[PDB]
Design a protein around this ligand. Structure first.
Ligand SMILES: [Cl-]
Ligand SMILES: [Cl-]
Ligand SMILES: [Cl-]
Lengths: 142, 144
């Protein structure tokens, strides 16, 4: 028994239409909702610092619905050749934060209005070259 | 004149050690007026932390735990382990570079270097002793 962050399980459907689960660290807030404190790698329509309602099933906390979006954006990237240096620089310039899953998959958090024509244009240019592919997993405020 | 009570405190940092096993290190410090925690010891083992870093904390089971970094001090933390003795020229270089040391027994030190003091000259001495199998070192926290 050691001190740990609370853990949220998000059920989602993968690219093969099969059920999958992603676990995210965060905090159970005084109102009983959950503050997400990791950048989601796979679950859709969620971002770092979103506040979500939960359903408890014994020892597990499951995502139920979004209560308050942080306004952050989540971009997933698969690297097909190499990660371009100017893309890394642009992520940093726009206050982005990277979470890696191995060397060739990453999720990037952008604060409100930091993902816009600048980053979308660079990502599109590298898709055209088949250097990477990206998903707009979460686009911020609905 | 009498001693006045101050907001001294202790924090537990939960971390994974060099073998990827869960571990805990307690650090002494001072509560700050904003509720954050000023670390006032050189961390011996926990990574990514330095003397005089300011960190956010969480309370659980009547104890305080590290949660996340608020403001890095810019200090660097270097862990050094030796076979049997710390060479005199290494100790002198640490001192010349304004380093402060904390012992864990006779063969282990964690060293704080102020901004810009952990440099290639210091690393060169560490590297020469590493090549001779007399010590190993780790960049636990790279500052400014
Ligand atoms: Cl889904
Ligand atoms: Cl005080
Ligand atoms: Cl110390």
């Amino acid at each position: 028994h050691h001190h740990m962050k609370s853990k949220l399980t998000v059920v989602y459907y993968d690219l093969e239409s099969n059920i999958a689960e992603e676990i995210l660290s965060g905090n159970i807030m005084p109102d009983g909702n959950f503050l997400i404190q990791e950048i989601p790698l796979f679950a859709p329509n969620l971002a770092l610092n979103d506040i979500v309602a939960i359903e408890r099933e014994d020892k597990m906390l499951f995502f139920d619905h979004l209560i308050k979006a942080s306004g952050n954006t989540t971009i997933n990237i698969v690297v097909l050749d190499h990660f371009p240096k100017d893309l890394l620089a642009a992520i940093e310039e726009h206050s982005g934060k990277i979470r890696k899953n191995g060397e060739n998959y990453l999720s990037v958090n952008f604060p409100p209005k930091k993902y816009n024509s600048d980053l979308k244009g660079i990502l599109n240019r590298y898709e055209e070259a088949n250097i990477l592919s990206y998903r707009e997993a979460c686009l911020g405020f609905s």
